Amino acid sequence: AVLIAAGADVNAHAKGVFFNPKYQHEGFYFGETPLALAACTNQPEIVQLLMENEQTDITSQDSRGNNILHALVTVAEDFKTQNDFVKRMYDMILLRSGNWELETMRNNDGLTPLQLAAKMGKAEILKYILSREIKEKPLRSLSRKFTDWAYGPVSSSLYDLTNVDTTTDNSVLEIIVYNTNIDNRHEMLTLEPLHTLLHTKWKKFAKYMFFLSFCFYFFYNITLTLVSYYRPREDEDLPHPLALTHKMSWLQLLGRMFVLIWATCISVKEGIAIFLLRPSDLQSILSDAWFHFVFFVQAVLVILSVFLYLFAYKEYLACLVLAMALGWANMLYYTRGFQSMGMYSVMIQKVILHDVLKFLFVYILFLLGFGVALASLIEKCSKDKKDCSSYGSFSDAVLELFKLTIGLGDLNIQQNSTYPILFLFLLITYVILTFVLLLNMLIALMGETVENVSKESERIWRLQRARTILEFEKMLPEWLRSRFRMGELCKVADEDFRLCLRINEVKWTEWKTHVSFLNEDPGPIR
Amino acid sequence: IQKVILHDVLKFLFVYILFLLGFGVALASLIEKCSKDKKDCSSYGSFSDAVLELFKLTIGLGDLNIQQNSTYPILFLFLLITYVILTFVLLLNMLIALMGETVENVSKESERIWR
Amino acid sequence: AAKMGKAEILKYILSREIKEKPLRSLSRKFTDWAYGPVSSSLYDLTNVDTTTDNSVLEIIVYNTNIDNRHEMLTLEPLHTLLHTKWKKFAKYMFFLSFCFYFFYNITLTLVSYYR
Amino acid sequence: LQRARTILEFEKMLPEWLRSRFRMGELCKVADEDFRLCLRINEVKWTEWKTHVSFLNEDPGPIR
């Protein structure tokens, strides 16, 4: 305070490399101004000392384009690691300014402080901003939550939907759903305006478009199965019924034509969806774009079986059978619409990654290891000239040890072995390692995985259904988006209309007299 | 028994029949006409026969013969091992793990439901 | 302390930082710089690294008598010192050990199978 | 612990001039005529607020 009165510049910028570090262990980014340093290092007395000085530029902006409110979002962390002082510095600076100028300012990559919290995954600052209700009378215009009426326990609130709904570009809802970088997307969609807004989209249009998507893809797999199972099975009856290369005036020939149309509609539409969303990270393919990738492969093999048919290579029938078996396995995508079967498909994804792939690595090491050792111990079968042993090859001994595991066939030890006791020692050692050890430890490890992901399988399901809703919304035309629009215009303040969303509550603990309602008459008027 | 059938067995039987009828058509349409040996060349000749052979494969009865009348014998073996991994390794072992989750919850309440 | 397995005395001695000015030479941890939250420390490596004989690192790894070796290697100078050895030379020698022993099992399998 | 036993056996077999090349640490003037070959670890703490006395360097950057 002595240096301030003596005339030090309160608007200096620290532009060095230490104050803009490349890595987190190199320096300390705080916002480059002495106002941002006092705010980010938990010194509230120097902050309110600086804001009283009339030379203080509170809307200044650094080299990144950040202001004081962008800088507090960047340094925010959890409750456990840091504290909740960043949430209190955000509130104290905002109420001192008194207008919307800090909240609508955009940095160099074009983000407001509200969009920057959702981009980086700051779940505690984002919870504050969306439900911000100010009871004070002159500063009530800075709120985003308004109490419409109240009577006893019952109350009705209004949430502002300005940049959180998908009417503009880069909404809060769009950034959270499509953010492959952060790893807490499924915790940020439980917030109280974002939870109701997805439930309203599912009731009005998304559940009916999800049922029409199911019926077309079911009929596509029926008419692909029937024209492949009921072929003309002769060499004289050579032409294939698909694409209708011979006109015999057959009724319902469009079923051979509906396959070719709908296969090109898929492979074009799935080639675009892969081309736009390109992850280089492997963990984003298996988490977000598995069914985008596997609907495209199934649709290419149907198209490829036609162009390979006209060249008469007689290898088209390999491509159709792969197209049927992959086609009926893709019907497990449509379990998203139900909660009970949708949480069950999240279990299958976590069990294959964590348990089955570790099992199959160690199993093939034992199968191919004991398979060579048994196969090189059998003599030549020219003494009986046929049928002396079933372990004569490497291909035969691997097949016999695989049937031994799943329990098929019969066990014969009267082989053509050079050493018959050594053949039995290696075979019982195989049964102990696989039947007793590995297959029973697989059950014990799956019970460890199920116990952990049962806490999270509901929130992972709601993230997967939320991605379906926002893709149905992008394809329907513009005049449908005006018809299925959520919210209602509300006279919030003097000449302020904000298109808000209404949510009702009941509270039995907090008793208080009601001031700062909007309406006196507490009913549902009209 | 009442809580296990509702929560575990019916979800298992829905996904199992999708895989059984799905791989059953794919294997059955890959077998040729059996008029070269005139009898007994393949046991996957029909849709009714291939569904029966994949059901005996799950409960462990019979014998596994791969010398079929297939047009493509390596493709027939790839689809058959893919069926064993999905049902014998994945679905039947995850059924045991999910029942242990149900038993742990309803053991707190099974006495009061009985009364 | 490392020979007998005294994990609480050993944690004290390795991270010993004395803020007092005349007795600051008795420390084994020094603050190099600091600015706000961020800071940089220096840990002494006199008898804990494997340059001499009977280091603290060598005694803890090879001590068959005690039964808490895996808790004593999480200490803050001993944890980083093993991570630095793995990045510079140990991971490349571990890959060369794998390739020789893999080729040794291939050429033992092939000359025994194809007699 | 099992990977740590692998690291110390690879270190005993490589020759002496390799051990000088792959050496950890750096000489630091700790006090008056005291050099100790120390190891550097960075931290971030958001709870403990205090003014900083008893640093070694005034300039808080990665010098060179």
Ligand SMILES: CCCCCCCC/C=C/CCCCCCCC(=O)O[C@@H](COC(=O)CCCCCCCCCCCCCCC)COP(=O)([O-])OCC[N+](C)(C)C
């Ligand atoms: C615990 C139980 C489960 C274990 C599972 C692992 C078991 C491993 C399998 C064990 C048995 C398989 C080998 C037996 C050999 C058969 C004989 C044969 O014909 O050999 C042939 C080669 O063999 C192949 O080409 C195999 C083809 C399948 C490859 C592996 C399946 C991939 C599954 C992935 C699916 C992912 C599922 C999705 C997961 C989410 C060659 O025979 P040949 O002598 O050269 O004769 C000439 C050929 N001719 C006759 C045409 C002219």
Ligand SMILES: CCCCCCCC/C=C/CCCCCCCC(=O)O[C@@H](COC(=O)CCCCCCCCCCCCCCC)COP(=O)([O-])OCC[N+](C)(C)C
């Ligand atoms: C600290 C302890 C560590 C391990 C200790 C060992 C150290 C490492 C040693 C390793 C092997 C040393 C023996 C090498 C030569 C033997 C091979 C041989 O001659 O075949 C013989 C079998 O012999 C076997 O089956 C032995 C197989 C290993 C058993 C080792 C004990 C494992 C304990 C597990 C449980 C006990 C299992 C008992 C065994 C079933 C018999 O041959 P044949 O088929 O009858 O042929 C007829 C002969 N004719 C054709 C010429 C007419």
Ligand SMILES: CCCCCCCC/C=C/CCCCCCCC(=O)O[C@@H](COC(=O)CCCCCCCCCCCCCCC)COP(=O)([O-])OCC[N+](C)(C)C
């Ligand atoms: C994990 C293991 C378990 C999996 C279970 C699921 C396995 C699924 C089953 C798999 C195998 C069944 C199909 C094999 C076909 C046999 C051949 C056949 O005859 O086909 C026949 C049809 O087939 C039928 O009609 C089947 C009848 C049973 C229906 C399903 C059982 C309901 C169980 C509910 C009980 C609830 C229990 C209560 C629960 C609390 C027709 O054959 P065809 O060619 O037309 O020949 C002409 C007929 N003729 C000869 C008379 C003239």
Ligand SMILES: CCCCCCCC/C=C/CCCCCCCC(=O)O[C@@H](COC(=O)CCCCCCCCCCCCCCC)COP(=O)([O-])OCC[N+](C)(C)C
């Ligand atoms: C990012 C990664 C995603 C997946 C990558 C692929 C992308 C999607 C691609 C999809 C299919 C592309 C190939 C289509 C045509 C092949 C069919 C064919 O010709 O039959 C062949 C088999 O060929 C197979 O078995 C391939 C089956 C799919 C294996 C794909 C790898 C899965 C990995 C799982 C583990 C590896 C399994 C290895 C395979 C066992 C052989 O035919 P045949 O029976 O010998 O007949 C004799 C020929 N004759 C009759 C004319 C004389």
Ligand SMILES: CCCCCCCC/C=C\CCCCCCCC(=O)O[C@@H](COC(=O)CCCCCCCCCCCCCCC)COP(=O)([O-])OCC[N+](C)(C)C
């Ligand atoms: C009021 C509520 C509805 C209002 C709006 C409805 C109009 C819609 C307006 C425009 C939609 C344009 C569709 C684009 C075509 C591309 C084809 C395609 O890829 O499949 C698309 C077809 O799924 C649907 O979109 C269903 C809606 C189409 C219905 C068209 C008219 C109905 C005619 C019939 C009248 C029957 C009458 C019966 C009732 C009387 C979507 O594919 P997907 O499944 O999303 O992708 C696969 C999943 N994946 C993400 C993993 C890859």
Ligand SMILES: CCCCCCCC/C=C\CCCCCCCC(=O)O[C@@H](COC(=O)CCCCCCCCCCCCCCC)COP(=O)([O-])OCC[N+](C)(C)C
């Ligand atoms: C390209 C072919 C692949 C199959 C080949 C096997 C080798 C491939 C290599 C590795 C195997 C795959 C690793 C598993 C990865 C996750 C699986 C999964 O998504 O779980 C799903 C369970 O529903 C299923 O998809 C289970 C069936 C697996 C494929 C079965 C093969 C079908 C037979 C065809 C035979 C011929 C094949 C012809 C072509 C070769 C549901 O999980 P989720 O929670 O919904 O997560 C998805 C996230 N998302 C919804 C937002 C997107």
Ligand SMILES: CCCCCCCC/C=C\CCCCCCCC(=O)O[C@@H](COC(=O)CCCCCCCCCCCCCCC)COP(=O)([O-])OCC[N+](C)(C)C
């Ligand atoms: C059925 C199985 C049999 C065997 C199948 C074999 C393979 C099985 C494979 C996978 C298993 C999964 C099977 C998928 C079943 C349907 C898909 C689905 O999820 O539906 C969903 C939506 O569907 C509905 O809304 C219900 C139908 C109402 C009428 C819709 C007609 C649309 C036309 C009218 C418009 C004109 C448009 C035309 C002109 C443009 C169900 O959603 P829900 O949960 O019930 O909704 C309640 C949600 N709530 C609880 C949150 C409030």
Ligand SMILES: CCCCCCCC/C=C\CCCCCCCC(=O)O[C@@H](COC(=O)CCCCCCCCCCCCCCC)COP(=O)([O-])OCC[N+](C)(C)C
């Ligand atoms: C035992 C006495 C004799 C048997 C009865 C006699 C036969 C009865 C005939 C038909 C009854 C079929 C089931 C309907 C009731 C299910 C209730 C349920 O919880 O399912 C759930 C999902 O379950 C699914 O729906 C997934 C798809 C399975 C196919 C059934 C679709 C129903 C359409 C019928 C087509 C007919 C074809 C059927 C062919 C057999 C409902 O979804 P959810 O509610 O959103 O999620 C639950 C979680 N929550 C409650 C908290 C939200």
Ligand SMILES: CCCCCCCC/C=C\CCCCCCCC(=O)O[C@@H](COC(=O)CCCCCCCCCCCCCCC)COP(=O)([O-])OCC[N+](C)(C)C
């Ligand atoms: C179906 C068969 C065809 C597929 C085969 C293609 C291979 C690659 C296919 C899919 C990619 C697998 C990794 C996915 C991405 C990482 C995420 C993950 O969940 O990793 C998990 C599995 O990771 C493992 O440890 C697997 C070890 C064996 C891999 C090879 C088995 C091949 C099966 C046939 C063998 C013969 C083939 C020869 C192989 C040389 C790590 O498990 P976790 O401990 O729970 O860690 C938590 C997750 N974390 C890492 C994010 C922290």
Ligand SMILES: CCCCCCCC/C=C\CCCCCCCC(=O)O[C@@H](COC(=O)CCCCCCCCCCCCCCC)COP(=O)([O-])OCC[N+](C)(C)C
């Ligand atoms: C879900 C799964 C996804 C991935 C699928 C995984 C693959 C599935 C697994 C297996 C499928 C393939 C089995 C049969 C192979 C065909 C025959 C062949 O090529 O062998 C030939 C060469 O064989 C040799 O020379 C001896 C073996 C040398 C290497 C030793 C292997 C041990 C590796 C262990 C460590 C590695 C494992 C580490 C962990 C991964 C000999 O052929 P033959 O028997 O003499 O045939 C005679 C008939 N003929 C005369 C007509 C020609």
Ligand SMILES: CCCCCCCC/C=C\CCCCCCCC(=O)O[C@@H](COC(=O)CCCCCCCCCCCCCCC)COP(=O)([O-])OCC[N+](C)(C)C
């Ligand atoms: C034995 C075979 C004959 C019966 C078949 C008749 C069908 C209908 C029969 C009985 C009615 C089933 C629902 C009961 C009423 C709801 C209560 C409940 O416990 O739901 C549970 C099961 O709900 C499911 O999710 C089942 C999904 C598959 C249903 C169809 C399987 C048919 C089996 C053969 C396949 C071929 C048939 C083709 C089917 C298209 C929900 O599980 P949860 O997650 O623990 O939820 C907690 C409970 N809650 C919902 C109250 C919150």
Ligand SMILES: CCCCCCCC/C=C\CCCCCCCC(=O)O[C@@H](COC(=O)CCCCCCCCCCCCCCC)COP(=O)([O-])OCC[N+](C)(C)C
């Ligand atoms: C606990 C359980 C309770 C419920 C019970 C459940 C039922 C039990 C399951 C199965 C029992 C029935 C099995 C055999 C059927 C009898 C034969 C038949 O009708 O097929 C005929 C038509 O077949 C075709 O046209 C090809 C198949 C078309 C549809 C593809 C099915 C895949 C659906 C997957 C998704 C749906 C599943 C989604 C999830 C549910 C052909 O018959 P054939 O072989 O040529 O016969 C020749 C002999 N003959 C000449 C004398 C005539």
Ligand code: NA
């Ligand atoms: Na059996």
Ligand code: NA
């Ligand atoms: Na049997």
Ligand code: NA
């Ligand atoms: Na268990």
